[PDB]
């Protein structure tokens, strides 16, 4: 077939698309995460949005994935978390179903990434000492 180039689907337009396609609009979702009765319905909500964004950024940073939207890690994929093969993951399923499936193993994975990052920092410090 023929084509002209990529198209723009919107803020959450790639929600129903597969993971491979949805991974090409990560910046699109990322960039809108920061932006006397009505007036005080803004000050307290803006603060909450800021706290959520900074929580996400800190959580990324303590893994070594700072300033990155796709980040590979040294933590092996424990198959107990999920048994699906990649072929049926990145081409025949969306991210909402994935978040539905893996909702139980989030915090342990986060802690594993944290400790792996700390080990990496210590190893780098040891290596640069020589």
């Amino acid at each position, epitope marked *: *077939a*023929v*084509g*002209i*180039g*990529a*198209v*723009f*689907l*919107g803020f959450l*337009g790639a929600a129903g698309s597969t993971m491979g396609a949805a991974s090409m609009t990560l910046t699109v979702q990322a960039r809108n995460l920061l932006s006397t009765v009505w007036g005080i319905k803004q000050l307290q909500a803006r603060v909450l949005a800021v706290e959520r964004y900074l929580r996400d950024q800190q959580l990324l940073g303590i893994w070594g994935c700072s300033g990155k939207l796709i980040c590979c890690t040294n933590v092996p994929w424990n198959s107990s978390w999920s048994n699906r093969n990649l072929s049926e993951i990145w081409d025949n399923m969306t991210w909402l179903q994935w978040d539905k499936e893996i909702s139980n193993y989030t915090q342990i994975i986060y802690g594993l990434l944290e400790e792996s990052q700390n080990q990496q920092e210590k190893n780098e410090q040891d290596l640069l000492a020589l």
Partner: antibody
Amino acid sequence: QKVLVQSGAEVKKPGASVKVSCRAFGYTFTGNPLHWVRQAPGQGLEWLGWINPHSGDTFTSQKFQGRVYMTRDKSINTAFLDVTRLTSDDTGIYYCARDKYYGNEAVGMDVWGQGTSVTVSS
Amino acid sequence: DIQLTQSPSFLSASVGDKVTITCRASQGVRNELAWYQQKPGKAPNLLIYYASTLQSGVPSRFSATGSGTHFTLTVSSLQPEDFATYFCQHMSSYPLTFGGGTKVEIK
């Protein structure tokens, strides 16, 4: 919900210029490309080109280059086709069609406008 | 350009009968084909994309098969509102072109 609406019918003298509009409803205007086709009275469908509203890039058929131009306005979700140097052979119904465009490649036009009738005579 | 021919140009059949219409392309297109239905003086509608998949909302009686240069559209059980012009169009390489036109008429 996906709908395309054009302007009214046009009657022009030969050698003039005609502007056919096409506005989209029910889907993200920048999320799909737009084909521009025409069907002459009692004939088949002739394909002029297609435009990518997001990047603004266009393609025109090799038999229409330098004669027909294509533009879009994202602020109003509209696509404009400008045909210059009209002749009696240009009469017919002009359609603007949304391509399915799965996989960033042409697949098929599934949503069509009501069709703008353009006539050319002395 | 890529020449796209249809056969038969005109056909006669009754309700309940089967109609098979042949698309042929001068050059080879793998699955870059689409089948359309256009009624008199009305906007066309898509029937098949990828030469083997029905468009959403299309009746299941429609079916199509073929790869390369030869393609066929089959209406398994003809219906009263199935009488219209049929088109077969390629998009493998520029320019996109439509078929000559096949008209199904009642008997």
